[PDB]
Design an enzyme around this catalytic site. Structure first.
Site, mmCIF file in Angstrom:
data_model
loop_
_atom_site.group_PDB
_atom_site.id
_atom_site.type_symbol
_atom_site.label_atom_id
_atom_site.label_comp_id
_atom_site.label_asym_id
_atom_site.label_seq_id
_atom_site.Cartn_x
_atom_site.Cartn_y
_atom_site.Cartn_z
ATOM 1 N N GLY A 121 -43.270 -24.781 48.384
ATOM 2 C CA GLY A 121 -42.759 -25.266 49.647
ATOM 3 C C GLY A 121 -42.785 -24.170 50.693
ATOM 4 C CG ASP B 24 -53.796 -21.942 43.130
ATOM 5 O OD1 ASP B 24 -53.629 -21.169 44.097
ATOM 6 O OD2 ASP B 24 -53.825 -23.184 43.247
ATOM 7 C CG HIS C 261 -50.384 -19.691 45.277
ATOM 8 N ND1 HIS C 261 -50.736 -20.059 46.557
ATOM 9 C CD2 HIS C 261 -49.262 -20.388 44.981
ATOM 10 C CE1 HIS C 261 -49.870 -20.946 47.012
ATOM 11 N NE2 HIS C 261 -48.965 -21.163 46.076
ATOM 12 C CB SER D 14 -46.059 -21.889 45.479
ATOM 13 O OG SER D 14 -46.302 -21.372 46.774
ATOM 14 C CG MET D 15 -42.230 -20.214 48.646
ATOM 15 S SD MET D 15 -42.133 -18.409 48.738
ATOM 16 C CE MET D 15 -40.369 -18.133 48.898
#
Ligand SMILES: Nc1ncnc2c1ncn2[C@@H]1O[C@H](COP(=O)(O)OP(=O)(O)O)[C@@H](O)[C@H]1O
Ligand SMILES: Nc1ncnc2c1ncn2[C@@H]1O[C@H](COP(=O)(O)OP(=O)(O)O)[C@@H](O)[C@H]1O
Lengths: 89, 295, 190, 191, 302
Positions: free
Chosen positions: C65, C170, C119, C94-95
């Site tokens: 996000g 990724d 990533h 991610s986050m």
């Protein structure tokens, strides 16, 4: 319980004849089945909860084996009586 | 004469470890009480602190220093006038000393209305009649483990949202004692508030070895009733000090632990022969270990 | 969705998430948005107040996000006194992986079949307008990229150079690979 | 989103977690600044002044910006009410969010360490259609707003108006440290 | 003879500084209520019924102090009741007849004095409708006016002639509103109890100036108390006007009010009472503005 305190510690009893009795040197063995005590101990020692790592839940022998005066006070015996019964078996 | 507050604390120091602030607060309130009696309301005192912090001893030590009779009382055994019966017994019923004596009432925090009002009956000068004592000039020392009083104060002084929260006991006000459950009228007769901190694991070693009635000395006597010497390792005294502290009973927990760790040898001691010394290592306090038996 | 109601014995009726908040469990489920991130912050602040010393359990099942939204959680986690333990359920990407690694060292967990992906950031916002505006937004994105790799490297006890390689595209990891990498400390089984 | 319910000990009172934090004088501005989200902030600021005019209000900002007039309703309410409004940047304070952040009581403007603060001249405050006469009017109004915002920013930051005019020409992104050096915030929180 | 209302107020002035309008109401009601008791009871003489007081005022404004200061002037039995300890007849809690049991106990069961005494009932505002609430008001209705209570030591106590002063911190009543029954009914009291408390007396909220006068003017004022303690050692105790202003401001800002004036005085004087008897050659102790406000020590004047 209050009436017994002076009997568990030293006082002078006055009892009918066949008499002033010094109770200082009388040894008292008290006991009973503190049925609700296992609940008191678990409330104090078992850190249960919801989630990962929370304790999840009885081992009554272990519980009574860790009884402390705090539990007997919560159970319902007056601290003045508990403090004069220093040895718990 | 009447020893000055400085003289009173000078000897309170010989019995009470720590609690320097409570001792000078008590030394002044007691001085004013007995200076008043040598002459406009009076002032009793409330002791706020943990279990095992020395509230009772501090009250006893004071009565000895002031040459007055002392009676032990408990708020949770309520009938209140039989405390005067005890106070009289301590001074051979010479009311001139009982009417100037000291009454310590424990567990005041546990009656937080009928009992509080009975305590107030004696604290507000009345005449007790036991098998006549004017209580007007009796100094009352009340105290208890007001653990929930910390929450009463935290509610008013960091705060939720970017906030961290005897540090707070030192700022107890009569209002906090009221919120805690005590009757304002009883509080109004106990204007002096003093606080006692919990003893740490070093102070509890002095509890174990310094006093005339110290635990180590008691159990050395027991072993000394045979031809056996009892000795404690410094590590043993430190581990037992922590064990008592970890139950939050302070000095109280030390007795149960000494009995616990030694009983496994005390039941053998009458049969062992040639034994000269029993040494309690820290291993004995910590685990199911035997003391060094020196034959 | 209908959120079940449960009864706490003390009776008090809770929705099941409010009941778990009572046990100091905070969920981050789905994308990290201003709104979902602020609820996590509100819960973290609330729990610190209830008990500054007890651990907070932050359960993460999130594809990622907004970075700024995730940073509001991240700074709240680090600020508040109680340790925030983090657990990966399903995925932490991610986050979500960043916040997983942001848990208190020694208390970062993953379930055995969870998937953790790290990533470099994508667009933190569009790059339209004039070349001068595009330059500014490209520079801001690079600063964020460096900040995230630097904080990741700190979390993982790795060199910044390692995170720069590994977050280039990724990077999917099993719970075991995330443990070896340094994103989590333990893998739970029972 | 499902907003958790929390219990306040007093008897007991059940709150949603945001009403619970309002009880602690915490007001959130999250997401875009709109007439509706700005009026809730105003309603909360007014309410908190009534509850206690002397205690600080904590205004937590995580916002990309929004309407200028909506942000000005918050701004004037912050300055009007007696209690100091402390401002904290969470995640980001951009555009009017940065303006409201800088508008906090001097000495009580905070940012979290990894927050992002962005200041810039306003964009369209409304479209510019119609006739050239209408476009002239709206262009003039936008320039007046631009000058007003730079002037108030310069006041907040203890900087010259000329500095804010340079620095707000294009999106100016700042770390919490750069915002502190600039004068938008006073302190950076860590623990 | 009796003290006139002016003499009752003069006595109230030596204990309560402030609350002038209530002083009149209390002084007149008592004077009349003890003129009624002394009225001949015979033949065609009109029977004089009593007027009870509902005393409305802020927390810590002096409601109780007025009631006690007043009782001490008449030499009547006096007790204080707390309406929140009371409950409905069939429930655990105190009966309304425990109010009389206390009033009677205070006079060693001499009913000829209990039946002419004064009762202050606190916390009326806490038994409102919004077993512990309305049920208590209903039980009190027949106690406030004449009934014969069955009182254990059973003693038959006629409460007809007892004067009741009932009161409480009706803060929600300022919001509802010069109190009128309409406001008390909306607050949550039942009309049957309101009509039995015909006289409404009101107290003002204390301000900083009132706190200063509390420190120095009353017969038992704090400053006078400690000056006497220092007097025992032949030492004069002086307060600067800034110190009294600082004590009052602290008690106000800390939101404790008059109740906290003793705490501040005791703290600032503790380090002198501790040394005072040993500080020979000392003649005066000065508590300055800084001593109260800052972390400073009292000034010793030798
Ligand atoms: N501060 C202290 N200084 C000296 N002895 C203490 C202190 N606190 C507790 N004690 C010891 O605790 C023992 C038991 O006293 P107890 O009545 O339990 O104290 P308390 O009032 O803290 O419960 C006494 O022998 C006493 O010496
Ligand atoms: N006018 C006053 N003069 C002197 N003392 C006062 C005055 N008003 C309040 N007090 C102090 O406030 C304390 C509590 O008074 P009280 O009337 O019982 O408060 P409340 O009525 O709210 O219970 C008393 O100990 C008294 O010393």
């Amino acid at each position: 319980q209050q009436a017994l305190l002076k009997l568990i510690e030293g006082t002078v009893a006055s009892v009918p004849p066949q008499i002033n009795v010094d109770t200082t040197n009388i040894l008292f063995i008290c006991g009973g089945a503190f049925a609700g005590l296992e609940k008191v101990i678990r409330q104090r020692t078992e850190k249960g909860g919801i989630g990962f790592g929370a304790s999840v839940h009885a081992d009554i022998t272990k519980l009574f084996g860790i009884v402390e005066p705090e539990d007997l006070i919560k159970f319902g015996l007056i601290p003045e009586l508990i403090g004069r019964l220093p040895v718990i078996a | 004469k009447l020893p000055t507050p400085a003289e009173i604390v000078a000897n309170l120091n010989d019995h009470v470890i720590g609690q320097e602030q409570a001792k000078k607060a008590l030394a002044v309130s007691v001085y004013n009480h007995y200076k008043r009696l040598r002459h406009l309301s009076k002032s009793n005192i409330l002791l706020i602190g943990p279990t095992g912090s020395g509230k009772t001893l501090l009250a006893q030590s004071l009565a000895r220093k002031l040459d007055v009779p002392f009676v032990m009382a408990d708020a949770t055994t309520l009938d209140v006038e039989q405390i005067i019966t005890k106070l009289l017994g301590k001074c051979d019923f010479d009311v001139e000393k009982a009417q100037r004596g000291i009454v310590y009432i424990d567990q005041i925090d546990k009656i937080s209305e009928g009992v509080q009002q009975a305590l107030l009956k004696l604290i507000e000068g009345t005449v007790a009649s036991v098998p006549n004592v004017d209580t007007t000039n009796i100094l009352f020392i009340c105290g208890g483990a007001f653990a929930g009083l910390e929450k009463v104060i935290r509610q008013r002084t960091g705060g939720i949202g970017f906030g961290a929260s005897t540090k707070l006991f030192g700022i107890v006000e009569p209002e906090d004692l009221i919120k805690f459950g005590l009757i304002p009228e009883l509080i109004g007769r106990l204007p002096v508030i003093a606080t006692l901190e919990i003893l740490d694991e070093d102070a509890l070693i002095n509890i174990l070895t310094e006093p005339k009635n110290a635990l180590v000395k008691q159990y050395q006597a027991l072993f000394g009733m045979e031809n056996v010497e009892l000795e404690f390792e410094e590590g043993a005294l430190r581990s037992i000090a922590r064990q008592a502290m970890e139950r939050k009973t302070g000095a109280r927990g030390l007795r149960s632990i000494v009995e616990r760790c030694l009983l496994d040898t005390m039941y053998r001691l009458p049969d062992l022969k040639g034994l000269k010394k029993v040494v309690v290592g820290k291993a004995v306090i910590e685990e199911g270990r035997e003391p060094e038996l020196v034959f | 969705y209908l959120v079940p109601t449960v009864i706490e014995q003390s009776e008090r009726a809770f929705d099941i998430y409010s009941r778990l908040l009572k046990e100091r469990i905070v969920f981050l489920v789905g994308p990290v948005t201003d709104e979902s991130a602020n609820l996590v912050v509100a819960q973290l602040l609330f729990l610190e107040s209830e008990n500054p010393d007890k651990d907070i359990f932050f359960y993460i099942n999130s594809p990622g996000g907004s970075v700024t939204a995730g940073m509001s959680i991240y700074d709240t986690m680090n600020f508040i006194k109680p340790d925030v333990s983090t657990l990966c359920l399903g995925q932490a990407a991610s986050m979500g992986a960043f916040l997983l690694s942001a848990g208190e060292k020694g208390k970062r967990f993953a379930l055995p079949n969870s998937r953790i992906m790290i990533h470099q950031p994508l667009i933190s916002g569009g790059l339209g307008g004039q070349a001068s505006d595009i330059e500014i937004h490209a520079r801001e994105l690079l600063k964020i990229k460096e900040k995230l790799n630097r904080l990741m490297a700190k979390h993982c006890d790795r060199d910044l150079a390692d995170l720069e390689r590994d977050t280039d595209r990724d990077n999917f990891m099993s719970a075991e690979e995330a443990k070896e990498y340094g994103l989590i400390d333990q893998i739970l089984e029972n």
